[PDB]
Design a protein around this ligand. Structure first.
Ligand code: A1BC7
Ligand code: A1BC7
Lengths: 459, 461
């Protein structure tokens, strides 16, 4: 219904356009050629995945992790906050370092810093812009940056525009690769050996595409061994930790008691906190560096009063414990899914033959917590078939494919939210087991859902 | 005013003497570079917000923030959507699209005469998306040297390997850049790649206006095959320029001649955000190739509702009186200052320079941006003089502008008054006479009175 119409519109958007542009102006011809590159791999994006918003599919795909958007709970606190300031000055006035600073945003920043165990907080209009500010303003000429290969797009962008001339990736979440990257970097830079410059380590506390967790404590001990003079600093992107991990949602750094061991933290508002924005946490030196050397921040308008107030409302709900039941339900639902799927009659065979692969589901019991992110893998030649199967079963997931990941690394990403139900998880597990069975049957002799999409294409 | 100045003074005191782990020591060393030129930024210029100084400083050009007019429409908009879904859901191309934001985009496009619109959280992000998604390999970009920081950043991250600046607002320089770029690229000569031209409608730190009609004629001359596209950054034009605030492009009837336009919400529209305007091909290019957009959360409902409210105020004519009042007040300032007894002498000697005030009468309209120059060695003294007179302005210095090109930026707002302009004119004339007097007295160590007070407070703390 809505699923089929969203899917027909998607199919039509992949039809090549350059053959109809032969007499158009050069400028538009060449843009439609560039769009045709993405169309030619059925990867052109247009209107996204929205069947869940109309209730026509289960939401196993959105970033509304605590369901604070879905329930209106954030909206009600946001409106309460605006009602406590009936004469509020909506407009900031300009740049945060020119006409745009004001008492309310500084007070809200300090509330958040205090709740999260940091000396200061600086507000941005997104997590992406916070990472841009960090890696353009913080690294010094002669510094080196050592980063997990799977840091966010905005970190890669920020590092590429950085003053630091040494940037080293290491294999994702691999402690031996981290040690080798640190060792090799320290040993090849005289200014790092003598301690006149620093190694900046960039990690995510929870990884957007894989759902695993940064071994922060272990990486800190390694950093101290390779850098006896202490000339290093960690930067932790907690986009997918805040609200989900730790008591009252303080995130992974505070949960591990590392708030004084991590120089820079980024906590964003676009996922569990159900709005937009972010704060960068650090001491006054870090904050003043951002205000003076992050060109991106200097040259943009400071947040309006409503944008600050909605962030305060999110933190209000967290700080007062109003989110703890939802945060706990994520844990329950995710483990509920792990137990159900790994207990299915087909789980062993499908994992053996490579038909299904859910790495976060392996050894989840040896974890102090699970995360809301469940990437699900099949054979690379089956990935669209898996998505089509879930889609036609009215389960909304996000397909992950080139250009978001390399060709041949495609998957689907299931997001488990606080407002999901055990019945929905039951339906997800059954639906997954159907797909696994259909493929096991085919290999021992096109799946039905793909047949259906391919029929729509032929139409 | 004094508390702001004291805090500013202390912030310039060198910290590295006390510095400490390597990481923090090197940071405060970098901060000390700014402190040593008394140019560290911290809390900005805010004395006007509490009424302790006149606002000749802020970007609240139509006074929609000051009057509460935007706030009231924004809250009425929210009340008309009592069950609104606050959270977008994710990225605009994944979980974060929804009907309300698509409808508000199209309403803004229709108001501005464009085919389609795409919403961003800022004008900066809009420019980042444009220059990272739109230029193709083999294209050239020809840009005014004074485009915005975000445009410089985006162009550096561009796939275009030819990028050519031209001298600010200079039609001869533009023609030279276009013709030399055409003359050296065979694929521009044969029409198979494009020249992208990047300008601002109204220039943030200079207040002059792009001669857009004249640039389009030159482009058509140099590119007879039509293989060019204009990109107009209208940050300082929406709300202030054109009938009902539609901006410069629409004022000139060039909606179909300028392929890409940026209209931002952080100035006259008194909030935050932007839209990029163009046809569906342009919009699809941003959605697919601007990684900054693909990898960020789509706007919340209130962020879209406050922008809708600002455009609804404009489209219902509720900003036209304020827009006309800016024009009156700026022209009133120009007539007053250029009528001052000391004007001719101060401008001849270079004690005062206000280029936008010369030949203002021959303009079809004026802008709110009034950059005021003195001698470079007096610019902080000028700011001190205004600040102590309880007049708030923004002091502009490197890195915002090149070394040796510092100035102060007055912004005129609909909410200002002729009496406030009178006091500004008088304060500027006092400053001019005092500095003329010092220069003629032959005592090279003599400090003006405002700067004396600042130096006294520095001596204390
Ligand atoms: C675009 C949504 C999204 N990813 C966003 C992240 C950001 C950007 O934050 P925002 O600009 O949206 O505020 C910074 N770091 C990390 C680790 C992220 O996952 C997702 O669907 O996972
Ligand atoms: C933020 C301060 C400000 N200038 C902002 C401009 C931007 C960025 O817009 P935002 O990111 O703030 O939305 C793009 N283009 C132009 C021409 C601008 O003047 C000013 O005080 O001049």
């Amino acid at each position: 219904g809505k699923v089929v119409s969203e899917m027909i519109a998607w199919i039509k958007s992949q039809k090549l356009i350059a053959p109809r542009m032969k007499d158009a102006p050069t400028f538009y011809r060449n843009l439609e050629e560039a769009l045709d590159v993405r169309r030619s791999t059925q990867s052109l994006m247009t209107r996204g995945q929205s069947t869940w918003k109309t209730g026509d599919a289960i939401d196993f795909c959105s970033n509304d992790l605590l369901s604070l958007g879905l329930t209106g709970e954030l909206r009600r606190e946001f409106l309460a906050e605006l009602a406590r300031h009936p004469d509020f000055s909506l407009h900031s006035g300009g740049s945060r370092v020119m006409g745009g600073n004001y008492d309310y945003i500084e007070a809200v920043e300090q509330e958040i810093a205090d709740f999260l165990g940091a000396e200061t907080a600086l507000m941005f209009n997104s997590g992406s812009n916070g990472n841009i500010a960090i890696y353009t303003a913080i690294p010094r000429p002669g510094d080196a940056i050592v980063y997990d290969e799977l840091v966010h797009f905005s970190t890669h962008t920020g590092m590429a525009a950085s003053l630091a001339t040494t940037k080293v990736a290491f294999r994702h979440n691999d402690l031996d690769a981290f040690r080798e990257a640190m060792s090799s970097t320290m040993d090849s830079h005289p200014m790092l050996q003598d301690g006149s410059r620093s190694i900046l380590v960039s990690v995510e506390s929870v990884y957007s595409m894989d759902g695993d967790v940064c071994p922060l404590v272990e990486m800190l001990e390694i950093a101290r061994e390779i850098c006896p003079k202490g000339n290093f600093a960690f930067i932790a992107d907690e986009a997918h930790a805040t609200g989900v991990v730790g008591p009252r949602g303080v995130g992974l750094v505070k949960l591990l008691g590392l708030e004084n061991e991590v120089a820079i933290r980024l906590n964003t508002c676009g996922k569990a906190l159900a709005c937009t924005g972010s704060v960068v946490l650090g001491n006054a030196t870090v904050r003043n560096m951002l205000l003076n050397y992050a060109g991106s921040l200097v040259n943009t308008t400071a947040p309006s009063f409503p944008s600050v107030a909605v962030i305060r409302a999110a933190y209000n709900l967290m700080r007062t414990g109003a989110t703890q039941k939802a945060q706990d339900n994520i844990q329950h639902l995710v483990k509920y899914f792990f137990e159900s799927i790994t207990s299915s009659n087909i789980w062993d065979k499908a994992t053996d033959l490579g038909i299904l692969s859910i790495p976060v589901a392996e050894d989840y019991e040896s974890l102090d917590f699970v995360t809301h992110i469940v990437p699900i893998w099949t054979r690379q030649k089956y990935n669209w078939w898996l998505f089509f199967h879930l889609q036609l079963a009215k389960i909304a997931v996000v397909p992950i494919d080139y250009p978001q990941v390399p060709k041949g690394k495609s998957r689907v990403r299931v997001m488990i939210h606080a407002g999901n139900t055990e019945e929905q998880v039951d339906y997800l597990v059954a639906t997954l087991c159907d797909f696994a069975n259909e493929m096991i049957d085919i290999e021992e002799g096109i799946p039905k859902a793909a047949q259906e999409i391919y029929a729509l294409m032929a139409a």
